[PDB]
Amino acid sequence: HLVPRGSNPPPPETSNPNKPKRQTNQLQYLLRVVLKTLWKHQFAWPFQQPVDAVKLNLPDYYKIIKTPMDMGTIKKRLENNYYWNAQECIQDFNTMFTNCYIYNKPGDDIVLMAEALEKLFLQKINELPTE
Numbered sequence: 001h002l003v004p005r006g007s008n009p010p011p012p013e014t015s016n017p018n019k020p021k022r023q024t025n026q027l028q029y030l031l032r033v034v035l036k037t038l039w040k041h042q043f044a045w046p047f048q049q050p051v052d053a054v055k056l057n058l059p060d061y062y063k064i065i066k067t068p069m070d071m072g073t074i075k076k077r078l079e080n081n082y083y084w085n086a087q088e089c090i091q092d093f094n095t096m097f098t099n100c101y102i103y104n105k106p107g108d109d110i111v112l113m114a115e116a117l118e119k120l121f122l123q124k125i126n127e128l129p130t131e
């Protein structure tokens with residue numbers, strides 16, 4: 001391991017009692033449809049939890065990525081009704097993807113994984129119900 005255990009940041013928050021939130025049918029769909037389908041995809045597993053820079057030997061990760069996001073966080077945010085609207089959640093997915101494409105080079109296996117999840121994401125977003 002390039003770096004000691006403990007060198008991960010605290011994960012992104014999944015609750016914030018003073019943050020405004022609302023349940024919308026669009027947020028319900030984000031959980032029930034979008035998250036559940038990407039979650040069980042064969043390429044999801046690197047995205048199901050915060051990047052463990054220690055375990056995975058990416059000691060530079062949190063030098064480069066200052067706004068981390070992952071689908072474990074997003075799943076928790078949806079289940080806990082953290083969001084005010086669908087857009088704040090979509091923002092989280094886009095942040096997760098962009099981080100991957102910033103950190104890695106095009107064609108790297110991790111990027112092909114993210115690209116495939118992103119394709120499916122965008123397909124499922126396409127059918128977002130009207131509020």
Ligand SMILES: CCc1noc2cc(OC)c(NS(=O)(=O)c3ccccc3OC)cc12
Nearest residue numbers: 046047051056058099100103104109110113
């Ligand atoms: C969002 C998770 C992530 N973003 O960028 C990464 C780069 C990684 O190692 C190259 C790893 N390491 S890994 O063992 O989880 C891994 C996953 C898929 C393909 C290759 C790979 O490690 C070489 C993870 C990420």
